[PDB]
Ligand binder design. Structure first.
Ligand SMILES: O=C(O)CNC(=O)C(=O)O
Ligand SMILES: [Mg+2]
Ligand code: NI
Ligand SMILES: [Zn+2]
Length: 331
C-alpha cells in the first residue's frame, strides 16, 4: 500500500505531465497521495496562470464576511457577519491596515503559534465564495475554469444526464481569515490555486480517519451535534492542532504559497487560515473514484448547510433514500 502513514505528498509535474489533468490526478493517487486527504502540486516553471495581477482591484466583493469567533482559543465556532460591499482594492487596503495586518513574526511556525493563541480575539473580514476566475483564457493547463464538469463525470460513470453547472470561486483573504473543518459537498475533490499574496496554512485528516475527527467534534461541540447529525457541513467549527494531538486525532499540516496548487481528496477533512492579504481560486471536481464516496456522503438536513443548485442532482441520483429529507432542509 503506497503512503501508509498518510503523509502529505508534494508533486513537481513536468510541462508534459501538466497537460492531462485527469491523468495526473490518477498518477498522484497511484503514489498514495489521497491517503493524506491533501496534496500539493508545484506547477512546472514554464507555466503561468495569467500574465500579471496588476488589474484586479476593481473586482467587487459584494458580501464581505466578518468572521466572529465564540469559544476558547483552541476550540471555537465562527459566524459570518455580512458587511457592506467593497472592491478588491478597498479590501487589500483594509487587510494592510494596522487593525488587520499580519503581525511581525519570525517564520511560518511563529505565525501559526500566534494564530492559535490569538485568533479568537479578532474578527477578520473574508471575501469568500465569489463566482469567477483569474485564469487567462489562453492558459490551457490546470485552468480551473476549464475542467471537466462533475455533471459530465457522473454521466460518463453512471449513464444518467443531469442538470447543473460547476464554476470556480475566488477567495480574497487577510490575516486570520479562517476556513473551518469540513469535507467538500458530496465529499467531492477540491483544487485550490493561490494566485497571489501571502500564504495559506492547511490542516487535514486522512480520509480513512475522518470518523475520528467527527467523533471528537461531537464531543467538543455538543449543542451543535444535537442540532444536526452532520453539523460539520455548517462549516463553522475550529479545533487546533494542539487539541487534535491531545485527543490522538491523526492529521497533517502544510503551508501553501503563491503559485502553488492544493488538491483535497474525497472525505479529506481540512481547515486552515490565511497569513495576510491573498487571493485563491478553487473549484470542486470528480473522478471515477469519487462516485463511491458521493454515494455514502453525509448530509445536513437541519436547514443550516444550504448549498448550490447543482447538489440537488447529486443527492437525487446517488442518494435517493436521503433525497426527500435533504430537500426539505433546502426548503
Ligand atoms: O481557501 C479557503 O478558504 C477554503 N478552501 C477550501 O476549503 C478548498 O479549496 O477546498
Ligand atoms: Mg479589476
Ligand atoms: Ni474545502
Ligand atoms: Zn445541519
Amino acid at each position: 500500500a503506497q503512503n501508509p502513514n498518510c503523509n502529505i505528498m508534494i508533486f513537481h509535474p513536468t510541462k508534459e505531465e501538466f497537460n492531462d489533468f485527469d491523468k495526473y490526478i490518477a498518477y498522484m493517487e497511484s503514489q498514495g497521495a489521497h491517503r493524506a486527504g491533501l496534496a500539493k502540486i508545484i506547477p512546472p516553471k514554464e507555466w503561468k496562470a495569467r500574465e500579471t495581477y496588476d488589474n484586479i482591484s476593481e473586482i467587487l466583493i459584494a458580501t464581505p464576511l466578518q468572521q466572529v469567533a465564540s469559544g476558547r482559543a483552541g476550540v471555537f465556532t465562527q459566524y459570518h457577519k455580512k458587511k457592506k460591499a467593497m472592491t478588491v482594492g478597498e479590501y487589500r487596503h483594509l487587510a494592510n491596515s494596522k487593525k488587520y495586518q499580519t503581525p511581525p513574526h519570525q517564520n511560518f511556525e511563529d505565525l501559526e503559534r500566534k494564530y492559535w493563541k490569538n485568533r479568537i480575539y479578532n474578527s477578520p473580514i473574508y471575501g469568500a465564495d465569489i463566482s469567477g476566475s483569474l485564469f487567462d483564457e489562453n492558459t490551457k493547463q490546470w485552468n480551473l475554469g476549464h475542467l471537466g464538469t462533475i455533471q459530465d463525470l457522473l454521466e460518463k460513470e453512471c449513464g444518467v444526464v443531469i442538470e447543473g453547472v460547476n464554476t470556480p470561486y475566488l477567495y480574497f483573504g487577510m490575516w486570520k481569515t479562517t476556513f473551518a473543518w469540513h469535507t467538500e459537498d458530496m465529499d467531492l475533490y477540491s483544487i485550490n490555486y493561490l494566485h497571489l499574496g501571502e500564504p495559506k496554512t492547511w490542516y487535514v485528516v486522512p480520509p480513512e480517519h475522518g470518523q475520528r475527527l467527527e467523533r471528537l467534534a461531537r464531543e467538543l461541540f455538543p449543542g451543535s451535534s444535537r442540532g444536526c447529525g452532520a453539523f460539520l457541513r455548517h462549516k463553522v467549527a475550529l479545533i487546533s492542532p494542539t487539541v487534535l494531538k491531545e485527543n490522538g486525532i491523526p492529521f497533517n499540516r502544510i503551508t501553501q504559497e503563491a503559485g502553488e496548487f492544493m488538491v483535497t481528496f474525497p472525505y479529506g477533512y481540512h481547515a486552515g487560515f490565511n497569513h495576510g492579504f491573498n487571493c485563491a481560486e478553487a473549484i470542486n471536481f470528480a473522478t471515477p473514484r469519487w462516485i463511491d464516496y458521493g454515494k455514502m456522503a453525509s448530509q445536513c438536513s437541519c436547514g443550516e448547510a444550504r448549498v448550490t443548485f447543482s447538489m440537488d442532482a447529486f443527492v437525487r441520483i446517488l442518494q435517493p433514500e436521503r433525497y426527500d429529507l435533504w430537500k426539505r432542509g433546502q426548503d
